[PDB]
Every structure is written in structure tokens, then in C-alpha cells.
Amino acid sequence: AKSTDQTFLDSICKQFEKNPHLQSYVVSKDRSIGDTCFRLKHYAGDVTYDVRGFLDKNKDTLFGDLISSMQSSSDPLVQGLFPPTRPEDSKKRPETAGSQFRNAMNALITTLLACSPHYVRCIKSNDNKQAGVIDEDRVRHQVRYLGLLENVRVRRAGFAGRIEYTRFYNRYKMLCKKTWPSFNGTAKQATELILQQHNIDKEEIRMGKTKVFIRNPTTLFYFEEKRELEMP
Amino acid sequence: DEDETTALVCDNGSGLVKAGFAGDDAPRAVFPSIVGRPRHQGVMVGMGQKDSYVGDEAQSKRGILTLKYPIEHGIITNWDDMEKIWHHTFYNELRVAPEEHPTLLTEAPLNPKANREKMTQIMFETFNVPAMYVAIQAVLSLYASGRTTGIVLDSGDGVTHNVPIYEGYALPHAIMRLDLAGRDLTDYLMKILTERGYSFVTTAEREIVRDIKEKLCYVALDFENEMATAASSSSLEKSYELPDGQVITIGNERFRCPETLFQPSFIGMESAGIHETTYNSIMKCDIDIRKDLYANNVMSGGTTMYPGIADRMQKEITALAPSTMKIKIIAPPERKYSVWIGGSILASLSTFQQMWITKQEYDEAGPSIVHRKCF
Amino acid sequence: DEDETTALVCDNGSGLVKAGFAGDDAPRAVFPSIVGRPRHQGVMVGMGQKDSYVGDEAQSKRGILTLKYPIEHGIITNWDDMEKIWHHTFYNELRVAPEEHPTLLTEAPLNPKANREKMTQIMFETFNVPAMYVAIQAVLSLYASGRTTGIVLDSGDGVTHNVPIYEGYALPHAIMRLDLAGRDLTDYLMKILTERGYSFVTTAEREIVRDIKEKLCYVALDFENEMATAASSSSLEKSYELPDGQVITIGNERFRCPETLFQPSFIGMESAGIHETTYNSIMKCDIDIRKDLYANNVMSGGTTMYPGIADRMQKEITALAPSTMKIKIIAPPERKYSVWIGGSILASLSTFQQMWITKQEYDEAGPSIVHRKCF
Ligand SMILES: Nc1ncnc2c1ncn2[C@@H]1O[C@H](COP(=O)(O)OP(=O)(O)O)[C@@H](O)[C@H]1O
Ligand SMILES: Nc1ncnc2c1ncn2[C@@H]1O[C@H](COP(=O)(O)OP(=O)(O)O)[C@@H](O)[C@H]1O
Ligand SMILES: [Ca+2]
Ligand SMILES: [Ca+2]
């Protein structure tokens, strides 16, 4: 408690501002950052924080003196608000809440790791709830700070003209050999069968799990022609 | 609770041990430090006596116990007993193994270098403690308020410490160590009671004095005026029917013993009252440091709960000292656990890694590893 | 305010720094020049001490600060500290970046050539300053009245300067540099106080002397007649109850120290009183230049606010010097900021372009660019 806000600040700048991915005024000579504030880089942009009330608001420490009072009261609700002791959270009771909240977030991560989640991400049209109006800056920003177009170049792989495997399949079916319902099932062996029978080098193409990757448009002509001079 | 090693919190003294579970705010188990023999012969077969009796077990039945004091300021007459005293704390109540969680202890300033290593030897070699530390009493009571500029006076049963720790620690001498706390008060009363005939001889009833003391006894505001008050039998004659069966009207006996605090001349020493030692720690430091010291004086230790202990300070300090600033002494209400409040912190700090000792660190720099690097 | 780069105004000395926003008339922030360590150990964890403490932060709490003086006339014991002293001024208060606005500084006459380049290196290389300059103290206090014919004597905490700058600058020697100002006065009093017993030892209370000085202390009109006056206890015994708590009756101590000004014999030197040095700067110049010099003598520096500093000049100057012209000394009332008033001007001048230094100009002529071209 004797380390208020100014002293606490000094315990951050020294501990960090050397470890990568964290700036401030001192290291990064930028006037936008106050001498009492700092620059925290997220996976998106830049954010600066104040210090008003940091401690009392963050401490959260809730000892068993304010809690026990209501428990010993005489009312069907006052003690009812404190329901049957130990609901999905027991272990041991007497301990600062600083660690209790730390367990709350840990109960969120551990249970998400070992499973098969599903992804859903939404974007807002506009702040005026209008059906037809698109705010370019706001929308573009959302696509930016979420890093979705990067996945379009990573989750995919990154280049110019892109096509799938599943959608590419039901389109060029009658242009390839041994790519019919009689397929073995193995994609890695299927894709190779598609190219090896037309005599094409290995490194010329790049195959992941989904999305086919051919660099530069001209190569598409190279494919169209390779098929032309092998069988009239 | 479960995840993360989770460290315990403890604070051993020379009279009362403070220890609880982990991540707590206050001590959960405070057993007395007593261990004697059955000078008598136990029934000898009605158990193979041994156990000098300890914990609530011994304190409950003193009668047939020759309470032998092991730890007397600095020197421990015997370490063998301490081993089985700590084998009770972590297990019989806490029900947790030290071979799993770290450990935190307190450091009695100016304690023989050989002692801090003897203790650690018990942990690292037998109780396998890869992580522990021993912090300094007073400094813990500090880090728990809201300022980096206060003088602290922490004491209890061990020895008195006048530590002006605010901005930093250790410079010329300032700090003081005085063997005159708790146990000393319990030992002095029995001597003075002999004037009236009462003579609590053996060391068993010696403890009863301490028990009775912390219920009615108080400190003399001014022995001169209170002496003339003796003529009356209202504020003096106090009632306390011995649980045995013999009233002891502690009238002029209550505010007689505490006078020794301000007058160490009654215990064969040249040490002056605690208000002189205050000057002794202020006059040494810089000149432009005083005005703010008087504005903040931390007084920790349950010993400072005697009625008439704080109001006297304002009378003697304002006398022979500069008098143009804000004279102000912070005497925390429950100032006995002030060390325990700070203890729970150090055990949870991460910077603590910069200070604590790791298993391998004890072997690389030898036993002196502790106080050879830190302070 | 917004349009046009807009330059700042500053004036650093060896005791007090004067700096404010831009286009101002007077300094907005005048923080003291102090930076010491915690010889003590900071609480060491109750912040990673470092910051020797500075600004209103250090001055507010000297107590636990070993005030280390970096700049002593010419030699800077360490430059590393100066870097973080300037990192506080422009930002913590002014809230403006030097990587945007020009900068103006003062030049201590006859300062090692290596120093003027070391400073500029900090700006051009790190703080990226495409435009700045360092003007000469006294000359600034000049250009701010209504005549081109006056002699100036500017000084404060650094060193004394008798600069007869009126029609031009620099010819034979005239000008003088004397290490005897501000800091010298603060250092001399503590030595003389030892005769009465008072001994402000450490460098912290050393500053208290300076603080107390500028409230009551005054200069002796004639030490001979004032000595006989000591018999009385009205004009001598002055009251100043130490904010700590001990009155110091500064009676014959007030007008004792200032006597050193007129009598440098008390500080181991052959330098004569400031009224002889006046002749030393007048006798050198032409013969038909004097009659108008006496008619105008500029006295700048807050040091010249001591009661009994101006009236003495008329007594000693009229003695051993020509006496048929108008003896007249211009001692501006608030003459401490006389340099700051002139500073705001140079920063706004356009002809200034003929004098200042541009980014590229520093690389073409090397580091010496400054005092290798200008004077
Ligand atoms: N309510 C109380 N009022 C006054 N003294 C008390 C009170 N409770 C305990 N004490 C005293 O405090 C002392 C024990 O304090 P403690 O902080 O545990 O000491 P130590 O740590 O030095 O062993 C004993 O002298 C005891 O009599
Ligand atoms: N009101 C005042 N009366 C007399 N001396 C003063 C007064 N205010 C400040 N001073 C003195 O002026 C000196 C500081 O003047 P300054 O012009 O800032 O000096 P420098 O620039 O040489 O550091 C200090 O010696 C201080 O005690
Ligand atoms: Ca103690
Ligand atoms: Ca000066």
C-alpha cells in the first residue's frame, strides 16, 4: 500500500521497456506519452493509460471480515445471496481476491485449450443503426485491428490469385485424371496424382491443407498450355 | 489454494509464534512457545513422557511441567527441541507439507551469523526447501499504508528496536537494539510483588503473571500525582479473583512495573527512557530530515496496547526536542499483526525472486549465502 | 502558440535554472539545481532509488538526499546526470518537444571550448535540434531599455562579471571574471557561524543557509560604526525561529558575511573590492569615454537585492575616481530576470538568423562551428 501510483509506475518501466513489445516516453521519445503514462502495444494498435485510482480499483482484496457479517445475519435473503457454500469454487476460502480473480481467468483458458471450439466473428455496419449506410473508416478499422486480412495471407499462405481445393474441385473435375469419385480419399496423394501425370516439377507449386497456391497469373497460362501439348 | 506452489506465512519470536495457512491476512494458529519436562516422572508408563508438553497441550496443563525456555535473546540453549516444535506447526494444524511450499520467516536484527545458517540447514537438508527467505521484522510493518517516509518502532517479546526506516535503511547507527520487551516485563513483576509478600516462584505461575497483566494492568501517566491518589480506594484497588482462589488487589502494582520502561535505571542500565532513544535516532540523521519524522512515527507491537502508552509520548517528546513541526505518532490500533500483514505481501511479491534464496544458490556460495549477499 | 515553429526561452546557471514556455516575458518554471543519492539505500525496493531526487521533488525532501553538486565553475564532475535533468524540463512541465522548437541558452564567459561542443552534441545528435544558440549573459540584460551607451555587471550564482558593454564588446581586457557569487556566499557563512558554535555541517542544511539568508540578512554600510551599535539589542538581534525548533539570533552575523564582497582578503585572494574592479574596467578604455560611463552603470543579478548593496557604491566610487560628472548606477529593481527579458528577444529576432546555428552548419565546420565563427 505504501507503493502508490508514481512508485508503482517505476516498477514497470524498469522491469520492462527492454523486454520486446512494450514502449513508453523514455525509450520511445514521443511527446504523446506523459511522464506518468506509458505506451502498451497490443496485437492491433496503440493505447495510453492514466493512473487515477489504480490501486483501490485493482486491489480487489476482499478478506473474510466484510463477507462473514451478512452470513451471520437473520434474513431469508441476506444469507440467501450467499448460496449453498462452494458452487464450482471451493478449495480453500480465506485468501485475498487478487488471487481469486487470477483463478477466474485461468478457469477460462484451461477449459478452452483441450477441446474443439468453433469460430464466429461479427462486424458492425454503422453507429447509427442505419440499414444501407457503410462507414468506411470504422469498418476498415475493424478489419484492421482484428488482423483478419493477415490471416487471409497466413491462414491461407500469402500471394496474388487464390483458389480453394474444395471449390476448385467441383469446377475442374473433367479436366484431370484419376480425380473422380474413385479417389482414394487421401488429399496429399490426390493432389500429387493431379500434377505428376502432367509432368510438373515439385517446387513449382505449393500445397498446404486448403487453398491451392500458384504464384503469378502467367503460370495459369502455363497450366492451360501444358494440357494442350500433351494430348490433342 | 491448488495451482501454483503457494507459499506459507510465518513469524517466530522468542515468546509467541505466529503462523497460519497460505495467502492469508492474519495468523490462524498462534501457539505459545513453551517446552518443559516432567521433573516429576510422567506416570513414566502413562506415556513415555518425552514431549515437554507444547502447544495448547502444554499451556492447558502447566501444573506438572518444568517449562524450560530454549530461546533467550540470541542464544538457543538447545536446538534439538526446536526441531519437533516446527514438526507440529505445518502438519498438526495446517495439514500441509513444507516439502511442497516455500517458507517465510522473520529476522531478529543483529543475530549471530551462525544462527541464520543453522536454521536454514534444518530446512534445506531435511525439510527440503528449494525456496525460502528471512525478512526483517520492522520493515514489513512498514510496506502497508501509503507513504515512503515514516519511522518505525517494532517490538514484542524479543528485544526493542528503534528503526527509523522510511526512505532507506542503514547509515550510521540510528537503529537501536534493547533487550527489554515482553519476557522482561513478565520477569520484573514477580520481583516487585515480593514487597507485599506475594511471591510467584516457579516458572509455571510466572506465565500467569503475563496472563493477568494483559487484562487490567496499565501504565502510569505521572507516578507523582498517582501516588497521592493511593489515599483513595476506587481507582487503585482492582478486582481479580484468582481462578485458583485468592484475590489480588492490584492497585499500585499495575502502574508500578511499566514505570521501568521510562526508567531503565530500575533494571541496572544507563539506557534512558524510550523518548530519549527517539532523539538518539533523530539527531544522527541529516538536519532537514526531522520535520517530517515527527509528522510520522510508527509504533508496532502488541506490547503498545497498555492503557497509557501513547499519551505519554506526546508529553516527553515535545519537551526536549524541536517544537515547530507537527508532532505525530502513528500507533496502529492492532499493531501486533502489522508484521504479519507485511509478511503475506513479501510471500506474494514477484520481485521477491531478486531477494529470496534458491536451492542451488545455497550450495554455490556456501552457508553464508544469505547475509553475505543481502542485508 | 501554434503556427510557426515558436522557440522556447531558457537560462541555465550553476545554482538555479530559469525556463518557461515560449514567447513569454518571464520564467514560468524555476526549479533548483540539485541531484544527490540515497547514501542510505532508498527502502531500495520502495522504488529502485536512482533519481538522486531533483526539482521540487528533491528540494521538498532534502533529509535523505546526499546532494551532489555536478556543475562547479567550469568543470562538470559528471555529464550523465545533466541528461536526465533536461529530460524533465521540456516535458514534465512545458509539455512540449524540443524536437519541434528551437532553443536558447546562456554562455558563461571564458568557458572551456570543449564544453560548448559537448552540450550541442546532446541536442543535435539525440534531441535533434536543427536550430539553437547560446548567447552571452550580460549582453542580454542590456538590449532592454533605451540607449546604446551603459556598462553592465551581471552575476548570480556562477561567477561575477564586470562587462563594460555599451558601444561594443572586447578590446583589451576590461571585462573581468571572478569566482565569487551565490554559491560562494552560501559556503562562507557556515564557516563563520562556527565561531558561535553553530555548525551546519552536511550539504543539505547548507542550502537552508541560503534560504534563511534571503529574508533578513543585509550588508554592512560601515562595519566600524555598526560594531559599536552591537551594544544595543534592537537592530542586531533578529528573530527567526527555525522551522525545526531552535531560534538563531542573527545579529552581527547578517552584516558580517557580506563584508567579504568588499574585502576578498577574507577568502584568500588579492582581488580588491567591487569598487576597485570598477576602476580596473574604466582606466583601460579611452579617456573621453568615462564621463558617460559613470552616468550609467547597469547592475543585474538577484544577488544585488541585499539591503545595503547600492548605497555603498556611491560612497566608494566617488572616493578614488574623477568627480566632476554625473555618478549614476542603474540597478534595475527586479534585475534577476534582466537576462530573461533579453532572452525572449533574441529568440524572436530575425537578424538572429545571421548569428544562430543551423543543423547542416554544425557538420560543415565541425563541432567548433559555434565559437570558431562567433564571439
Ligand atoms: N490485548 C492485549 N493488551 C496488551 N498486551 C497484550 C494484549 N494481547 C497481548 N499482549 C501482549 O503482547 C505480548 C505478545 O506480543 P507479540 O507481538 O506476540 O510478541 P513477540 O512477537 O515479541 O513474541 C505479550 O507480552 C502479551 O501479554
Ligand atoms: N528576494 C531576494 N533577495 C535577495 N537575494 C535573493 C532574493 N531572491 C533570490 N535571491 C538570491 O539570488 C541568488 C539566485 O539568483 P540567480 O539570478 O538565479 O542566480 P544564478 O543565475 O547565478 O544561479 C541566490 O543567491 C538567492 O539567495
Ligand atoms: Ca519482536
Ligand atoms: Ca550568473
Short mmCIF file of C-alpha atoms and ligand atoms in Angstrom, two decimals, chain B residues 13-14 137 154-159 161, ligand 3:
data_model
loop_
_atom_site.label_atom_id
_atom_site.label_comp_id
_atom_site.label_asym_id
_atom_site.label_seq_id
_atom_site.Cartn_x
_atom_site.Cartn_y
_atom_site.Cartn_z
CA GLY B 13 9.54 -14.75 18.10
CA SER B 14 11.06 -15.52 21.50
CA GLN B 137 10.65 -7.53 11.43
CA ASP B 154 8.76 -2.64 16.34
CA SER B 155 8.98 -4.96 19.35
CA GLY B 156 7.10 -7.61 21.32
CA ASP B 157 8.72 -10.33 23.41
CA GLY B 158 12.19 -10.40 21.87
CA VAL B 159 14.05 -7.10 22.06
CA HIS B 161 14.02 -1.96 18.03
CA CA D 3 9.69 -8.95 18.45
#
